[PDB]
């Protein structure tokens, strides 16, 4: 009953914006004080690599450690479905623990973005809800952020992706704004980032004409 | 072996005729010592009555043991707790679980129907979307329909924790462009405790 491992994927945004640096994180948790030394072994499709950086083991409140190891991945290796395996070895482990991740398999699909105004009757309130509908995308990794006149926005939340009946995903993002900003004529934008999109990005604007 | 205690369907705990129930499950239980035990207590106090289907053979050298207990509406709605004690072999201290309705001043959902965006009208199928916001707790049921009969091709997102402390979600119905252009009405029906008579409805349709 040694430590257990977890292998997390890169943030969707860091993989669609070529100028950033996506990376997989291999987290070993439940490491005892008796044997705090854990060894990481990375692989990219079986081909072991050595460019991983291990952060110094952090002390936990439940008398154990949490060790982290990260692997930068190439914009193109991840989006081409390369598989990343993290091998973990520590004395309190009969046999090393292997874990694997990689983009979901299955043909990608370009989502459509729709912006939808507030219902006329929400206009009796002080804040209105602008809606952005992203449908028909695959795989499910996606990023969504609202924006106006340059600066981003604060009051907006985005539903998790949802598996549609045709096999693709859809999600809605909700931007809340002071009713007045809306009635004036400001132009808000829905920015979406998905591999399938062109240049992995697209934007749809909504406003009161 | 791990335990999984599940709560009743929102729809079930809101319609009296229907019968809500809490489900207890046991994942990863080998063929060796499958035989289990189930103890159900309500806020300490107990009662003996919890049907228990057999160990449905599984696709990973294990089984899926499920234990269901029928509960009383207002008891669930009135934050009652429920305990399930699973007694096994590879379990020295047979894992237990407790669950109850969410705490906090209930809040009434506001329902908003949104028409398809005009450019989606070039596809041969459109999206009718239903925004359900400002509700608490998150237990809720939403379904679409037209002409008495219920629609089928629709999807509802999970409740989302908003910024002000309430939840919201969206429900997307897909209808053939022709049915929409023709002017047929569609309805979003929401069931939730904080709603008068636990139910409200909002119709949507191309105004002629």
């Amino acid at each position: 009953g040694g430590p257990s491992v977890f292998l997390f994927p890169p943030k969707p945004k860091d993989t669609l914006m070529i100028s950033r640096t996506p990376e997989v994180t291999c987290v070993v948790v439940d490491v005892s004080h008796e044997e705090p030394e854990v060894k990481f072994n990375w692989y990219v499709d079986g081909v072991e690599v050595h460019n991983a950086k291990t952060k110094p083991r952090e002390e936990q409140y439940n008398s154990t450690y949490r060790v982290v190891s990260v692997l930068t991945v190439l914009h193109q290796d991840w989006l081409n479905g390369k598989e990343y395996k993290c091998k973990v070895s520590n004395k309190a482990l009969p046999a090393p623990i292997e874990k694997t991740i990689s983009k979901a398999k299955g043909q990608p699909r370009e989502p459509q973005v729709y912006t939808l105004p507030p219902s006329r009757d929400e206009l009796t309130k002080n804040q209105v809800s602008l809606t952005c509908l992203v449908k028909g995308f695959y795989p499910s990794d996606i990023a969504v952020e609202w924006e106006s006149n340059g600066q981003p926005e604060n009051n907006y939340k985005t539903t998790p992706p949802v598996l549609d009946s045709d096999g693709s995903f859809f999600l809605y993002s909700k931007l809340t704004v002071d009713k007045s900003r809306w009635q004036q004529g400001n132009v808000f934008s829905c920015s979406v980032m998905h591999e399938a999109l062109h240049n992995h990005y697209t934007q749809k604007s909504l406003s009161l004409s | 072996p791990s335990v999984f205690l599940f709560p009743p369907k929102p729809k079930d705990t809101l319609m009296i005729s229907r019968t809500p129930e809490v489900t207890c499950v046991v994942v990863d239980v080998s063929h060796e010592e499958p035989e289990v035990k189930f103890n159900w207590y309500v806020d300490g106090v107990e009662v003996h009555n919890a049907k228990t289907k057999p160990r449905e053979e599984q696709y990973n050298s294990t089984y899926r043991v499920v234990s269901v207990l029928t509960v009383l509406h207002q008891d669930w709605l009135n934050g009652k707790e429920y305990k399930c004690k699973v007694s096994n072999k590879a379990l020295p201290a047979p894992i237990e679980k407790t669950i109850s309705k969410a705490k906090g001043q209930p809040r009434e959902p506001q329902v908003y129907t949104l028409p398809p965006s005009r450019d989606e009208l070039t596809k041969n199928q459109v999206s009718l979307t239903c925004l359900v916001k400002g509700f608490y707790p998150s237990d809720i049921a939403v379904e679409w329909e037209s002409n008495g009969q219920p629609e089928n091709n629709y999807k509802t997102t999970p409740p989302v924790l908003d910024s002000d402390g309430s939840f919201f979600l969206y429900s997307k119905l897909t209808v053939d462009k022709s049915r929409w252009q023709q002017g047929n009405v569609f309805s979003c029906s929401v069931m939730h405790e904080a709603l008068h008579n636990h139910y409200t409805q909002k119709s949507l349709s191309l105004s002629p």
Partner: antibody
Amino acid sequence: QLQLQESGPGLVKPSETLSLTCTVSGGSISRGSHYWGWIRQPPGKGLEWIGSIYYSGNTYFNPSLKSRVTISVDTSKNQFSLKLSSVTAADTAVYYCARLGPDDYTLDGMDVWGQGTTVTVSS
Amino acid sequence: QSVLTQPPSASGTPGQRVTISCSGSSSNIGSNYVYWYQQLPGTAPKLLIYRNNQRPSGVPDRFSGSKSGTSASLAISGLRSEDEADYYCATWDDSLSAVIFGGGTKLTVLG
């Protein structure tokens, strides 16, 4: 208020590729509430839709001739453009650039049209 | 099934009232909004009616649009001379997935 002005070589020799541009004034394509497109009309016959484009890039073409058309926008200069390749005698007409229908995201009507521009495929 | 057909020509007489039809299909004029543009000799077409029968502010009440079945029609009342031009109907055609226009209708106020 809002206006669209076509710009382009009044002439194009066979097999070549036509190239026009549309400038908008009193309205910023960047607002993102409307689509913009091109419509041509051979002197004799009637009107024909070619394509529409959204400020973000996404464009819609006419199946009759998409394989040989190219549309693009430049937010900076606030204008969109057209490119018709392998021009023959058919592709000879007046090229208008209009904004799509009065309603936001309209994709089937043009409420505001450009002055017009002739394009003869001479030799 | 894939193209609107209007009368090649019309013509009337001042003060009168005329109608121009646009015979279409279900894949188009029968499932989408119809548009009507006016084109006075050597000019960029002018939007006359949108969404079957809406008149964009700046268009005479005499101009009206309507649809029914797989057809639509424009109707001019109180005809004048400044009305003899060419008129066209247009809608989206889900079969071709593109905008489409009719052939056009002449119409010349006789006088």
